[PDB]
Amino acid sequence: PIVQNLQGQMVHQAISPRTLNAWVKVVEEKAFSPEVIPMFSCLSEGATPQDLNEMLNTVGGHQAAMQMLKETINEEAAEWDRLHPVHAMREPRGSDIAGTTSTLQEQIGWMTHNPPIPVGEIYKRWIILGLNKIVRMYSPTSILDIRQGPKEPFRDYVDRFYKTLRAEQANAATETLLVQNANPDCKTILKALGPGATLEEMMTACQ
Amino acid sequence: PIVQNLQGQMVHQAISPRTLNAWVKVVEEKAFSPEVIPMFSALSCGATPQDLNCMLNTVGGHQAAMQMLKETINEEAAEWDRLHPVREPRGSDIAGTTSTLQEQIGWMTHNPPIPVGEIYKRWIILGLNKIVRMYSPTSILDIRQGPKEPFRDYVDRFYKTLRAEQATETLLVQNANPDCKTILKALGPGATLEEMMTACQ
Amino acid sequence: PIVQNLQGQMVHQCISPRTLNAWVKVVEEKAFSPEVIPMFSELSEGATPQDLNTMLNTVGGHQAAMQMLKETINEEAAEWDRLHPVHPIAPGQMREPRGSDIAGTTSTLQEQIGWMTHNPPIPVGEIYKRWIILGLNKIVRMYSK
Numbered sequence: 291p292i293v294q295n296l297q298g299q300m301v302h303q304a305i306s307p308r309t310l311n312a313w314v315k316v317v318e319e320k321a322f323s324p325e326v327i328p329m330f331s332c333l334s335e336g337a338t339p340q341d342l343n344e345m346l347n348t349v350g351g352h353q354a355a356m357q358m359l360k361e362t363i364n365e366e367a368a369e370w371d372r373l374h375p376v377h378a379m380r381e382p383r384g385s386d387i388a389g390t391t392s393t394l395q396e397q398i399g400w401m402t403h404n405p406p407i408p409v410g411e412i413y414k415r416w417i418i419l420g421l422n423k424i425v426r427m428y429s430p431t432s433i434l435d436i437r438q439g440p441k442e443p444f445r446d447y448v449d450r451f452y453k454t455l456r457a458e459q460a461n462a463a464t465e466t467l468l469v470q471n472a473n474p475d476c477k478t479i480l481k482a483l484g485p486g487a488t489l490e491e492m493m494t495a496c497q
Numbered sequence: 498p499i500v501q502n503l504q505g506q507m508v509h510q511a512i513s514p515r516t517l518n519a520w521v522k523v524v525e526e527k528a529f530s531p532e533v534i535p536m537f538s539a540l541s542c543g544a545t546p547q548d549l550n551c552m553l554n555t556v557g558g559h560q561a562a563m564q565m566l567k568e569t570i571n572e573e574a575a576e577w578d579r580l581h582p583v584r585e586p587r588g589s590d591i592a593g594t595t596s597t598l599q600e601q602i603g604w605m606t607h608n609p610p611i612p613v614g615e616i617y618k619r620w621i622i623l624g625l626n627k628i629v630r631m632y633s634p635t636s637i638l639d640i641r642q643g644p645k646e647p648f649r650d651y652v653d654r655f656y657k658t659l660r661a662e663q664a665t666e667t668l669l670v671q672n673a674n675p676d677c678k679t680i681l682k683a684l685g686p687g688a689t690l691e692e693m694m695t696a697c698q
Numbered sequence: 699p700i701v702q703n704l705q706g707q708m709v710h711q712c713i714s715p716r717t718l719n720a721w722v723k724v725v726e727e728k729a730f731s732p733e734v735i736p737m738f739s740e741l742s743e744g745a746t747p748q749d750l751n752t753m754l755n756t757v758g759g760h761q762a763a764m765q766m767l768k769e770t771i772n773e774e775a776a777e778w779d780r781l782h783p784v785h786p787i788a789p790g791q792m793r794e795p796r797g798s799d800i801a802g803t804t805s806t807l808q809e810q811i812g813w814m815t816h817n818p819p820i821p822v823g824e825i826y827k828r829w830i831i832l833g834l835n836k837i838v839r840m841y842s843k
Binding site for chain 2: 703709712713714715716718719722751752755756757758759760761762764765766769770773836840
Binding site for chain 2: 291293294298308309311312313320323325328329331332333335336445448449451452453455456488489490493494497
């Protein structure tokens with residue numbers, strides 16, 4: 291992260307043990323449930339590429355999934371190279387933004403430049419793209435297999451439905467499916483409500 | 498959690514892991530009890546729209562409630578744009594969806610300030626209110642004192658329910674049991690709750 | 699709460715999640731045992747009216763007690779207005795707070811900080827906390843069998 295040391299030196303912070311332990315705990319406890327993605331995005335707020343890499347390396351397993359993330363970042367690193375030639379301090383290449391071929395001081399220089407070249411935020415975007423892919427991969431159940439049970443309260447079914455939806459996705463189609471997958475009685479009610487009904491109204495109707 | 502006690506620029510302190518985890522846990526543990534609303538409003542003290550979104554997005558379970566919340570946020574964003582056709586922040590900027598952290602800081606710390614964090618928090622609370630009302634297990638009309646229920650316990654259930662539908666104490670007296678009702682009728686209007694609870698003790 | 703910064707000025711600080719959690723747990727676990735009151739007094743050091751309301755509002759159960767507390771606050775607010783009426787001038791000093799301002803219902807956070815950090819300070823947090831403690835005393839007495 292960034293701070294103004296002494297007069298205003300623009301130096302890199304630590305990442306706190308509390309932050310790192312909270313992150314390690316989330317990963318160990320929640321697997322790759324979709325909520326892990328916003329949590330990462332908040333725990334890494336203002337992070338340099340080096341910090342982001344530290345967080346990712348401190349994971350403790352999940353195999354080549356990271357390697358899958360590594361592949362995605364390489365693709366984006368290649369895309370960065372396509373979009374960032376030697377334009378008309380240096381200009382960052384894909385490997386520089388990913389923290390592989392840039393120095394901490396260069397990263398800070400880019401991030402603290404006027405205008406600032408947000409290499410940390412661009413790298414974070416690529417990491418999130420990879421994590422999103424992982425989450426969709428690790429999704430245990432298809433949205434089409436969320437069907438309301440014969441005796442299941444509508445609210446519980448909608449909870450299951452949107453949990454799964456979040457995993458699968460990271461729309462008219464979806465609400466149409468939500469109604470289609472309800473049980474006979476509640477489906478009858480939902481169909482009776484007509485077009486444009488909000489989720490609030492749907493939940494109210496089958497309560 | 499935003500403060501400016503830095504140096505060159507305002508310091509948005511990345512919302513603490515303690516804060517984020519406390520909010521997630523409250524929601525998981527308390528379902529949508531009405532005390533969730535003050536708790537949220539306190540946990541998000543001075544928080545920027547980014548921080549608010551963090552809080553909401555970290556909520557693993559109860560996705561049904563969150564979507565409802567997402568709908569309410571979208572409604573309020575649309576209403577904002579309708580009332581304020583416009584840099585000046587639009588509905589989606591206030592919700593942190595189409596604004597950058599730096600823009601959010603700029604608006605919040607501007608002179609005059611555009612308190613986008615407080616506006617967004619207000620919209621979220623509007624949505625949470627609707628959810629809490631939804632999740633109220635009992636109607637006020639169904640709260641009547643049992644023949645062997647202590648009046649204190651009945652009052653506890655009565656005001657728990659009332660809090661839930663986020664009116665009159667006349668219902669409180671009308672639904673009390675015959676003996677206690679007789680005494681409360683005699684105490685009149687303008688008897689305090691202390692006096693009423695004493696009388697039926 | 700209000701706190702002293704690194705240069706000894708009075709500033710607003712957000713109520714910590716440890717403080718919030720401690721208070722909620724005390725109330726749940728001690729119910730309205732007498733020891734609730736000293737704990738409240740410790741937990742609310744430097745609290746604004748808004749902070750005091752937060753603490754009261756975060757209590758989930760015991761809604762009979764909390765309603766009694768609201769009645770006691772209203773009584774004390776009325777008494778304040780009777781005894782301290784508001785005196786169109788702000789050269790850097792604020793308005794006189796009325797009962798509802800001290801209770802945090804009709805005052806803004808900014809106004810509360812202004813009063814509390816003035817020289818001399820107008821102790822709206824301490825005044826409100828007095829009223830609250832008065833109410834809690836009544837509740838403790840009533841709940842004692």
